[PDB]
Amino acid sequence: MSIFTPTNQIRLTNVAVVRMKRAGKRFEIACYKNKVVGWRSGVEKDLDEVLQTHSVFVNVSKGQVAKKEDLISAFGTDDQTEICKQILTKGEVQVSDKERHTQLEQMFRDIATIVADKCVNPETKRPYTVILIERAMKDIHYSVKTNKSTKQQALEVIKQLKEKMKIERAHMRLRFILPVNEGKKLKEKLKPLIKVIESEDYGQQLEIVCLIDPGCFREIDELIKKETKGKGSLEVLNLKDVEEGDEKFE
């Protein structure tokens, strides 16, 4: 009948969960989101820190603890701490509530990254925004994977759109025409950003430099010269394209 309080039916903890199934029994443990990764990398932080709780779970969502009877039937021991370590080591990461959200984001991130590395619009070699690229990649259709590397996936993505469209999988070379007085500042921004070659400096004449950068970086380059100088800057292509980048196939 009507009670003065709730019946209490919540045991949902929002920390990370590492899953290991053995002997027809799923086993989980409460760890943190960052620490599991660290452990698997080989970086020590004791078992006190990586484990949020030192007792073995059947289900972290339900909050059902594994009995000694069960534990000994799977791992050949009833000591929980030891089991936890084992779970951490050989088991795979399982998404909790927080982690589900992250998962959703992850895909978005990957597409943003992998697709935007190397490309140009059809007809001539010019830079262009990521949204367009994304659209293009959707048209041809691509499914990202966390089991593959991002760099590896980039190549795959470009493969599809090399067949379909005209694109640039390699670097290009630029040529800027800088003044002698106002150009020094500009140069110092550019030098650590990208590789400078063919640097011809004069007093009586204007300063000339050439760059090595990807097809999407031209825009980035040209823009930062204008606002820093406070005048227009002449952008010319030294080459429309040049070898290496994702053309050497890393």
């Binding site: 209490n8 919540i10 045991r11 903890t13 929002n14 949020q52």
Partner: peptide
């Protein structure tokens, strides 16, 4: 002395 229910719950 840590506590399990930091974000979770128990009676």
């Amino acid at each position: 002395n840590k506590m399990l229910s930091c974000a979770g719950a128990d009676r």
